[model samples]
Every structure is written in structure tokens, then in C-alpha cells.
Target: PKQVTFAKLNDNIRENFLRDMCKKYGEVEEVEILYNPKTKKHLGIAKVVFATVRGAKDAVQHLHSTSVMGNIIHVELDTKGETRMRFYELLVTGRYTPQTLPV
Candidate 1:
């Protein structure tokens, strides 16, 4: 099976920035921007699934730059094999605490 790495972006990184960065290499199959529901803002992390491994690699090479959205955004190969562990645990534990309560 092919390996997929997640990209950890900066909190300030926006959707447009992610699109531009990923498109630089190749077609992005899917992009998930993690956000804090309580704050209703970004969480400085994102998972970008590319159409090809080569494209993913290229994105890691080029997009891992000094500054993104005025702050340094770290981008590296997500080595954690089980990417869904967090979700799985949440499901098993029934930890569905909402980040924000209804006003």
C-alpha cells in the first residue's frame, strides 16, 4: 500500500493557502483542515491526500518553507501509521464533547 503523510500547518494558514500549496505539485484528492470548534478557528494542522505519492512528496519538498501566514508552519511526512487512531478512540470512548456550547 502507498504511504500517506499529513501536513501540519500553522494556525494562520487559510484554505486558499493550502489549495495553492498543494496545487503546486499535483491534483489534491482531498483536503481536511482541522479546526477548533470552540474557537471556530484553525488548529494548525491539515491532512492533504494527493492523487499520487510523487505529488505528495513534491508538496512536502516545496511547501515546507520558512513562513506561512506570518508564522512558521511545519510540514513533514506524517509517520504515524494509524492516522485514524484519534477518531477511533473518540468513538470507542464516546468522547463527543462539543468544543463550544450553544449560546
Candidate 2:
């Protein structure tokens, strides 16, 4: 998977902002701004999917610890390892389907 995960985002970060920023690395497949389903609040985390693993690698190398709107963000390629796969299994069980932040 060419998916990248980032954290320490500002509450006001925009999906398109992430799209624009990450596209510099490669073709972006999807950009998601995480939100808490119960509170409907920004989670200050995001997942971005690029079309290729190379793009994800470049983004992780170049964008990690980079400031976005004065906020330092941490970027990493999603390992999709056992732990994360287990988490995704939980998510797909219909529990964490969150809505986008409502302005």
C-alpha cells in the first residue's frame, strides 16, 4: 500500500491543503482528515494514499517534521503491519466510520 499517515496537524487543516502539499510527491489517490465520530472533532491526524510506494517514501522522507501552517507534522508510510491490520479490521466492523469535519 502506498498509504502515508501523518499526525500533529492543526485543527484547521484542510483536506485540499493536504492534497496540494502531498501531490508534490506523486499522484494522490485519496486524502483523509481524521475526525472523531462521537465528538465529530478533528483528530489532528490524516491518511494520504498515493498512487505509488515511491511517492509515499518520498513524502515520508521529505515531509516528516515539516511545518504546515506553523505546526510541525510527523509523516510516515503506513506499515499496514499486524497491529495496523488488526485495527483496520476493527474499523471495518462498522465502528469508526467518521464523517468529515463540518467546517
Using TM-score as the measure, the top candidate is 2
> Number of backbone collisions per candidate, in order?
0, 0
Candidate 1 per-residue lDDT over residues 47-76, each given as its tens digit? 677778788788777766456656554455
For every candidate structure, what is the RMSD over all alpha carbons to the true structure, in angstroms? 7.5, 6.7
Evaluated against the true structure, the overall lDDT of model 1 is 0.55
Query: Each model's TM-score, in the order given?
Result: 0.62, 0.74
Q: Count clashing pairs, candidate 1.
A: 0
Worst 10 residues of 1 by lDDT: 94-103
TM for candidate 2 is: 0.74
In candidate 1, which residue ranges exceed 4 Å CA deviation? 1-12, 79-103
Residue 85, candidate 2: C-alpha displacement in angstroms: 8.7
lDDT of 2 by residue, 1-103 (tens): 6988777677777698889999999999988876656666666667888999899999989998888777677677786633334334444344443222111
